[PDB]
Symmetry: C2
Subunit: 141 residues, 2 copies
């Protein structure tokens, strides 16, 4: 849609930051489109990932971190609030202990911090979606 | 690139048809981009798939068919001729007994026909690539 995918924005995160993403899958759920959101430690795409969030629409969600080039312990969820053929609103909040992921206003996943959120320098949103809105909030000290 | 992804073209295939695809992954191999090529029985994306070809760049290739809505026997290959960060040329030839997939001029995969190729009405190319060329040949009777 409006914003190009893969979408990359330089970013900083701390407690109280919220990342808001509005978009739509590019395929029906029968065809298993993916969505991936990665919080990176540098602008380079090969950099470490403090928070990796990957939706296989209609099947599962996997969350992980990539630290000094290597993937760590995967967290796999079968929770699937996303609806076939529908626009979604994703809200990722930085709490003191974890990221909290809201889908269409409903708490749907959390992921405890493995690396301090202050290590993030970039957010990338990619795979099989179009994007109409992306925002990182910067309202708190 | 030039051609929009997901890319859909109405198509017919028979023995001697060749589907040629030139493109580039949207991510480094460390980030595991995908490529998917589906030969569909109708223009609708939910239709059956006579030949499903899915590359997880740097990891594996899966091939299958989707028949009356259901996936059949997966064929999984670890052959990986695709090169990190590089443009690729894919050539899918319709032989009497199978599809043959050439990658950068090298025979790399084959898949025996489960449904007659004449059932194909559409080709879709999608996931994490850009496309610079797509052609279906129509030179033979």
């Amino acid at each position: 849609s409006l914003l190009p995918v893969p979408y990359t924005e330089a970013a900083s995160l701390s407690t109280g930051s919220t990342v808001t993403i509005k978009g739509r899958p590019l395929a029906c759920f029968l065809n298993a489109p993916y969505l991936q959101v990665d919080f990176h430690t540098e602008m380079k795409e090969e950099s470490d990932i403090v928070f990796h969030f990957q939706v296989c629409f209609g099947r599962r969600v996997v969350m992980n971190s990539r630290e000094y080039g290597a993937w760590k312990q995967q967290v796999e969820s079968k929770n699937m609030p996303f609806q076939d053929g529908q626009e979604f609103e994703l809200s990722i909040s930085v709490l003191p202990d974890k990221y909290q992921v809201m889908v269409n206003g409903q708490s749907s996943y959390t992921f405890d911090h493995r690396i301090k959120p202050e290590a993030v320098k970039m957010v990338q949103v990619w795979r099989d979606i179009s994007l109409t809105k992306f925002n990182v909030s910067y309202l708190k000290r």
